[PDB]
Amino acid sequence: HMSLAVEAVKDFLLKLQDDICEALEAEDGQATFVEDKWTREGGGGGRTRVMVDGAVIEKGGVNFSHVYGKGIAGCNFEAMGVSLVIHPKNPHVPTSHANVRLFVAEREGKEPVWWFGGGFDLTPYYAVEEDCRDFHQVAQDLCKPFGADVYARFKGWCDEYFFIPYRNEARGIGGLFFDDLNEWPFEKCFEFVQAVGKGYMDAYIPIVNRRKNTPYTEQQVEFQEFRRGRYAEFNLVIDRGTKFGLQSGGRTESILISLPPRARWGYNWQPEPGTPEARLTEYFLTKRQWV
DSSP states (O other): OOHHHHHHHHHHHHHHHHHHHHHHHHHHSSOOOEEEEEEETTTEEEEEEEEESOSSEEEEEEEEEEEEEEOOTTOEEEEEEEEEEEEESSTTSOEEEEEEEEEEEOOTTSOOEEEEEEEEEEEOSSOOHHHHHHHHHHHHHHHGGGOTTHHHHHHHHHHHHSEEGGGTEESSSEEEEEEEEOSSOHHHHHHHHHHHHHHHHHHHHHHHHHHTTOOOOHHHHHHHHHHHHHHHHIIIIIOHHHHHHHHTTOOHHHHGGGSOSOOOOOTTOOOOTTSHHHHIIIIIHHHOOOO
């Protein structure tokens, strides 16, 4: 077993949830996260913290989970992580997502198998060049202590993963994404995920503070809602964690914090040409070179 290492990761994750929620509550100023603590028989449980109808955060969820299972298909396992999605009220604040997680499977006769996964990413509506650059700079900078090609690898993985092929469209401007991370000693992988967690706040919170009071119109909210239909489609059609989780006994409401508060769909809907709305897909979502 790796019992003591796992306990350290768990303590990190619970503190990370607290810290992220505190940061976001400070930006909002009005609403607070409410916790829904849940268990499943034989299976662990989680702490789902949600914000609704804030001054800044219309719909936000920061989930901690620690699940145990018996059936590597036959192995006892534990999986723990923090996952979050934030949907601002103001269209000029991007949506964001982050995750950090560890999986450990105990093996008859052998050393345990383990790996980390995670990342963070930004989904603007009314994007701003310097925010996209600063987000990626935080990502790049946090990676540098861990290896010269770590940013390139995991930024590229993010662009590959958060993509809707049948619309030939990225979900957002990118960030970092990694899975199956065990090529470094455990302590180095743990350091890297702690860096990722801190980096989410470092990357996202300044943007929220900078953008939350930008003036906006009902037409910009309509665009936000049609864009949020695209977001719902990625999560429901493409995202593997959401798909597996719903298919396999996961806690529906915890999994689906990713879904937007309101979404719109229209036949052949597209942004009007020559507008800031159109520039999100014509320029920001295809640039994929921010540092």
